[PDB]
Write a protein that binds this DNA or RNA. Sequence first.
DNA 1: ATTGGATCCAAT
DNA 2: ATTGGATCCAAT
Lengths: 143, 143
Amino acid sequence: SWCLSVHQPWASLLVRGIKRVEGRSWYTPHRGRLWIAATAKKPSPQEVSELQATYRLLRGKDVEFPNDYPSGCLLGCVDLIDCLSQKQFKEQFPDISQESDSPFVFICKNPQEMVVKFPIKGNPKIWKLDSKIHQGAKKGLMK
Amino acid sequence: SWCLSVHQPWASLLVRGIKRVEGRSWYTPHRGRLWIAATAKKPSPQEVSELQATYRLLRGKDVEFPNDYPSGCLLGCVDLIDCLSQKQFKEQFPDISQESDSPFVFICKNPQEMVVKFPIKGNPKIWKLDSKIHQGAKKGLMK
DNA sequence: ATTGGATCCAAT
DNA sequence: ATTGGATCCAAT
């Protein structure tokens, strides 16, 4: 099983479905389930408030944000349906293409958030989950 | 007795007489003996080499530099003969006025270097020497 | 100044 | 990513 580390608060917005794409400077052929881990970098409470304000405008004034954006832990997963270039992204998702300017744009569907979030240390790019933590995360989803 | 903290390598150049003035953003009415302490900031060996190259050009190809520029210690003293404004400095010392652009310029004479340099922790601006270290420094000069 | 918490930086 | 050495920053 494969994982991507993402800075908070974006990491929790991805597993909640509020943020629908993730931009990177590199391509991956990976498709299917992609676990999402928060990096260790803690966001300032104003950074959280400004991002929350922006996503209310993009999604609707009553979007339900997570109460906490925990760092350094495994949060849940998405289905990585495509890794588009910025050109393909503008072509295929005109309504949200403004939401990432990155060279490659990861299209995420079916987000799932873990109720119990396990501590983890991440790596660059797409990296392989340890079996013991992946086993626990799979059993946490099926509850 | 009063002391001024100066970054190396300039601090040792002052007690050797190679550097003849010290520039600051503030004025002092202090005149007479002024002890010179090196700050704790260690200079890079290239910073020392570049400064040494400059002072050879200003003073003569055979100027004798100290072999070491020790940090965080009491180095010796000068006689502070005047604290000139930058305007007075240009008027009175035209041959060396290029050697400081500071708002106030401390004119130093009679430099004396201690053979044994005692560890010290400095302060901003002109500060009062502890009696025990000042007693030892005075006895070190008279040897 | 000195100090150490905050931030920057590079690992090969 | 994470890590910690290097550098920046502010103390009232």
